[PDB]
């Protein structure tokens, strides 16, 4: 559609940079110029792994139009930790991406508990050295995306959770840094650091960088809980007051940083409520002008409002297929509101949705 010569396919945008572009840090691709990434989460790959397949990424990377796809590896909560058969759908996603010409995005998602220095994450360094070693000499190495901890947060189910505050970003910091070096030991590949308060603090990664080339910082926010805001903080306000997560990655763009909403949906926070359309056309016109590449959550046929696909709902509507067979298609009825709304905006056609009766 017009207005989407930023959103590249990797074989002809290549290796991911970052460029400074009117004073601010922005994603580009090999030759300089402005990169948008649009895509799909994948719902935890332990509950809804059946979305790693063969017709559902040819569907989501043609008839969705999406250059990027991320790979949701829980590792608490019957995850990669008690469940290590779960890397195998990594890698599998890893293989349809590079065939179908889709970014990935590998992520550790750190989510329950919110430190991602927590025992159950021990794995951590070891995971992300054992995949970028089976990649690093591939043609295809440069589209995969690293993101180390998906929401560092106060969540204390299964360990330790995290303060929003300068100790909350230091502790991801701490976290982070050995593992950013091993992965630029092995590659050059752009790397997702998430930050407190669910990864709404992109302006506390903004205060204290991480000193290392190819380095983002994420925001994940929910439509209908995050509000839209265009006053920017005065400058010199002090972190204790930066709650608003819209006026939060203005001040990381304009504080020297390149932020990557590598996780947003169109409900409430929880993944339910709504869906909230117009507050989400606002987000992602903020999103799309700004040049911030962004992933939806989520590919599930659960009943939740964020899903992307139709529930079953005893009355009338079984759940739809996550493999939408050799079509490669999923039908408009087989999206939800959420799904075919986004799926809208990933394509940047017009958003006409079907009458539901």
Not at 202 to 219: K, Q, T
Not at 300 to 306: A, F, L, R
């Amino acid at each position: 559609p017009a207005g989407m010569q930023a959103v590249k396919s990797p074989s002809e945008a290549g290796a991911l940079q970052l460029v400074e572009l009117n004073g601010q840090l922005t994603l580009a691709g090999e030759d300089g110029t402005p990169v948008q990434l649009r895509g799909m989460s994948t719902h935890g790959l332990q509950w809804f792994g059946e979305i790693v397949n063969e017709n559902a990424f040819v569907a989501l990377s043609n008839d969705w139009g999406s250059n990027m796809i991320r790979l949701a590896m829980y590792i608490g909560e019957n995850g990669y930790a008690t469940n290590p058969e779960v890397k195998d759908l990594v890698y599998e996603g890893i293989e349809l991406a590079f065939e179908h010409d889709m970014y990935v995005i590998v992520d550790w998602h750190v989510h329950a508990p919110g430190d991602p220095r927590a025992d159950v994450y021990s794995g951590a360094y070891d995971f992300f050295e054992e995949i970028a070693d089976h990649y690093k000499d591939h043609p295809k190495n440069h589209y995969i995306i690293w993101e180390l901890a998906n929401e560092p947060s106060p969540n204390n189910n299964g360990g330790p959770g995290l303060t929003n505050d300068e100790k909350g970003w230091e502790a991801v910091k701490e976290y982070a840094e050995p593992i950013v070096e091993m992965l630029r030991e092995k590659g050059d590949n752009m790397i997702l650091v998430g930050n407190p308060n669910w990864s709404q603090r992109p302006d506390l990664s903004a205060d204290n960088p991480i000193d290392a080339e190819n380095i983002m910082y994420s925001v994940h926010f929910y439509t209908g809980s995050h509000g839209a805001s265009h006053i920017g903080y005065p400058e010199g306000t002090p972190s204790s007051e930066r709650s608003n997560v819209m006026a939060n990655v203005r001040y990381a763009l304009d504080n020297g940083v390149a932020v990557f909403a590598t996780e947003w949906g169109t409900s409430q926070a929880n993944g339910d409520g709504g869906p909230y359309f117009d507050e989400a056309d606002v987000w992602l016109n903020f999103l799309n002008k700004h040049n911030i590449s962004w992933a939806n959550w989520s590919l599930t046929n659960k009943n939740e409002i964020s899903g992307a696909f139709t529930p079953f709902e005893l009355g009338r509507t079984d759940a739809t297929d996550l493999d939408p067979g050799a079509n490669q298609v999923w039908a408009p009825e087989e999206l939800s509101l959420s799904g075919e709304y986004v799926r809208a905006r990933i394509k940047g056609i017009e958003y006409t949705p079907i009458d539901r009766t």
